[PDB]
Amino acid sequence: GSHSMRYFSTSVSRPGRGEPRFIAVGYVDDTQFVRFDSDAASQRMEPRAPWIEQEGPEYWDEETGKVKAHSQTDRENLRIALRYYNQSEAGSHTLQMMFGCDVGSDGRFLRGYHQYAYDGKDYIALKEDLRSWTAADMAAQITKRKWEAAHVAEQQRAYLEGTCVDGLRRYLENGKETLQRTDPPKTHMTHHPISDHEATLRCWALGFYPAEITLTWQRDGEDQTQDTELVETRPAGDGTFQKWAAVVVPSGEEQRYTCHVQHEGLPKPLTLRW
């Protein structure tokens, strides 16, 4: 199926506590493979997946330089942002960045991303056509004009459709026996009386990969959306993921409710009934 490479970086200013903290991580699909941390001693891009170890010293040299360079420019961008928003240098602020590309089954390019967020909200982003920018506000528009003048978009576009998809293609091959993997969820149901006339039905999905999944409750064959509780998908820590959906039901009416599970690793969607 399709695949993605993504880089996430977070810069956090610490007034009266030294330089801003910079943390970058790299993902192929739902598997992390590298990290960088400006507060760590190594001061290098570190491997966080087995299949990336097989990269030579050059790779680690190049990647380390790029991510270190980026930390310094986002460091400065935090300064520049204070100016644009007329904010004091006594407060702490955040600069987030996502970058990456998507490829189909045939390894062909599908989509590219280059996005920034200041204090948790959109700042500037490269549109889907990778030709123009989306400025979120008055401040980001200043940057947008700069990036237009400096032709940043054409540079990033080429990199996304080229270097990125080529890098993604290589990573997949190297992480073949691990990234082409598709683990179906093990499902089960729990049941607990909330009181003398009500019980909780909780639908479980465990040990699946990738993380993408859909858990749905129906009552008498009809989606029971509003009344449901649905937790965020969570990492088990072993490379697989977990999730559950719960409904509060009248005691003795358990059989009316059905849980429906959709996942890439499943031949057909599952149905669970207590």
């Binding site: 980026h70 400065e76 520049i80």
Partner: peptide, 10 residues
């Protein structure tokens, strides 16, 4: 491969 971020000046 980490992007080239030189021109990402705000």
């Amino acid at each position: 491969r980490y992007p080239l971020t030189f021109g990402w000046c705000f």
